[model samples]
Target: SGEIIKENGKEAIKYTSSDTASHKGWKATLSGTFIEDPHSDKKTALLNLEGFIPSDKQIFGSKYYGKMKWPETYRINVKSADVNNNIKIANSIPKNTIDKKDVSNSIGYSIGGNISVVQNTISYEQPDFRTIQRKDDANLASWDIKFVETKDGYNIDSYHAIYGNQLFMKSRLYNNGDKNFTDDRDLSTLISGGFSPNMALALTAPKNAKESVIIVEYQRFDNDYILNWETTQWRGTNKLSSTSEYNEFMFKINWQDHKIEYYL
Candidate 1:
């Protein structure tokens, strides 16, 4: 027979015993034996089971779990230009050109303003990605020549060092069951951030000279998900016009995906 019993010195023992015919073995029953059961109230009191539970036994599940969905359609528009003339050098190539076919596929555009930009296709320049270099030496020389038409007969000279290196991408995430856009759960913290394999051009100028300013503008359509925009400018100035020694300057701007623009 199998049995569980509770006993006190002066009281008779109470036992939950199994039938002897049903269970048989060389059973040894002791009068004053102690057994430990963690689930028992006495065991819990001995262990002080308070506010300590295993991870697998969490009482409340995570709220962010199974709550996010992808965006439906996301479109990004970006524009960069020479601050002085508002000339759009980066977008000069025709969208249909073989060099610009990818941009065309992605619905990119270039629109010129006050200054004129010579249209050219970005060749297969490997190490340097889709960058359009100025071929005219006269244009290169103009970097030092001031505009003779201004009051001082000279406007600060600046040139395009690199063009078409900035990148813009749009992603569309499909909405599935039990997943909808909501502020209760934020995915911005979950979104991945990294650099894209796009092209960028460097702007250079002489040392001790006031750095030239460039402009960058961007926008987004949907407000369901948060969008972040970043812009950066790099420049070099020569301490001695004769020597090759130069100093570097950089500026950066970070903001949400709203209609915004920055200079220099």
Candidate 2:
């Protein structure tokens, strides 16, 4: 004999979609589930429905595909599982709700011609600039590095400017190139310094020090970009005098992504 048990729970729903070439369109679906946990005796349920539909026109060529538009579906809350499953709802779209004007002024791109079309759809802009000043005097070394602006047009707010940290290092180095002039000479120097919590010193050996390399990592939301700078310094140590400065170099990430963008 089968026993009937009535369970009370809250339901949750979700949806997802994927592009398929066989259908020449996207496939989407919704799912529902009940939640059970050892920590709580209360019953809860979940439901999810998500799908993707391809555009009528094949914009990216035979190898490329497009996803469906937003505002995909509607939802309704019911008193019981049976009522929710059996109820049928009709869509009410008022006439003239949609704009009938032609979109002739809109810009369009050819298939596979501009990858930026795909990138721009999900792209956001975040322009940032930073300046750092480091000075060492006796046993005290202080450095101030801060972000000046998030975009080129205006100054960043005070709260944004305060996001950067200042570092103070108590460091001392002994001996200044007192070794032989051999290309492969291993000159050693004793270093004693206490860097701020968020600051670190990166040391490069002679073999890898042909050019000064500074690596910076920046991240905003889901996007991240690494910057590499090859800097050059003036030669000779003496009274403050004029000297020629070598060229400085820098490069961005690949063309697929630009600088980091902020997203909440």
Candidate 3:
């Protein structure tokens, strides 16, 4: 049972864990209000829940485990499953398009603002060896074997270079409108701050060499909103082999929807 109390003249629910002696203190505060959707007449509840727990403590019968310095707040936006229209937001997310000039540039794809993205495969046109020779001095802005996260979306670029006859991938992020609607889900420090990003990028070349493969292991994401990393996905079986110089790859991007079709 939870205690119903008026917080700042607003009704709220409060609950505390029963195992105070075993696991220290674990508490939760929930408050919500019903409001009409701004884009439509449908009513929905805007709720906020705050959890208080000790570091390294497993609460709710091993349901949740906290961090050493984990923040003490949580929230969820509740709406009907049938609604299709875009819910209203306060920020002015930029609306733009990918032009012919953008495709021809070195940074082949550019995206900004808040939009849903789906990664796809793109067909690449390889340049003739005689006409367009690969350059050893070509610049690749550190995309090789690196993970980058940005707030204003991504500007992706790639090209063939002479170094081991490899493809050089590069990118830069621009300052765009807010892309994150939710708060406190930043994962930039998870890898750098001695935590978890428990993932691996494995490149394998067979002993006698028939075909090589690139495999990436990452946490599975449902809607790109929740940060739970319960399940994992081993995504990749792309073919790689020696004398792969002539092989081509490309990226087709739609800036408006932040859509990008990538070659594995």
Candidate 4:
């Protein structure tokens, strides 16, 4: 009864927030879509997630919202918040243990402001820029984002997952953006609770796909900020295979920790 649910009017293995609601009290719902890539006629989801949170002081209290784009290129957008705020992010290699202290154009904007940036390569740097709520008691934080998956190839959905305890920041992130999930390029470092570590290179794989062919690939990056680490999807058939509905390219991700996985 636990691992049983329905999808498309058919029975499927059970996995969702409700199944774990008795444990972790955390709960949230996000839904949206986006284009396949910077240059593709078709569009996609999970790769580009933009949603809103009703309340939460650390992030979504005053209508918290965020958007994640360019799974590999890490592009973020700013929306109407009503005040001014900013952030300086850094990246690292060898996972979330090695602190490079280098941050790219990881910047922010004004309340009624709109900021757009697409980062393909990450660098190392150190800056004194700070503040999660921004400035003071009168903070200006409209939204933030989480990246779950990316378009690695044309025929599949590549993605990752995160595992954390009381500290979600300590949680690990995984992604398969182009199968280069094992390198300094996709790595990042962070200093949390005053302790620094290298956010390991994310190891990417298919989004829990069933009847799916596995492609073994090498692992990878510098990276940043708040997130949920869930994968969503797309659908495509093998150009050379038969036209079977078993074929799909949907993006999906689940939590590893019971609480984190349960709450989300």
TM for every model, in the order presented, reads: 0.19, 0.16, 0.17, 0.15
Report the lDDT of model 2 for residue 6: 28
Off by over 4 Å in 1: 1-69, 72-78, 81-83, 86-211, 223-264
Once superposed on the true structure, which residue ranges of model 3 sit more than 4 Å away at CA? 13-79, 82-156, 164-264
C-alpha lDDT of candidate 1 relative to the true structure: 0.18
lDDT of 1 by residue, 1-264 (tens): 212333232221111211111011111111111112222222100000001001110111122212222211111111222234322222222121122213211212112111122111222111111212222121110111001111212111322343111111111122221231223222121111101112122122122222222222111111112122222322211111121111111121111111112212
lDDT of 3 by residue, 21-129 (tens): 1112333222222221122222222222222322221111111211112211111111111122222221110112221111111111012111121111111111110
**Worst lDDT 10-window in candidate 1:** 44-53
lDDT of 4 at 123: 35
Residue 134 shift from truth in candidate 1, angstroms: 24
The prediction achieving the highest TM-score against the true structure is 1
How does residue 108 of candidate 2 score in lDDT? 19
lDDT of 4 by residue, 131-193 (tens): 121111111111111222222221113223222111122223333222212232322211111
Q: What is the full ranking by TM-score, best candidate first?
A: 1, 3, 2, 4
Q: Which stretches of candidate 2 lie over 4 Å from their true place?
A: 1-24, 37-42, 58-81, 84-264
Clashing pairs counted in every model: 6, 21, 0, 35
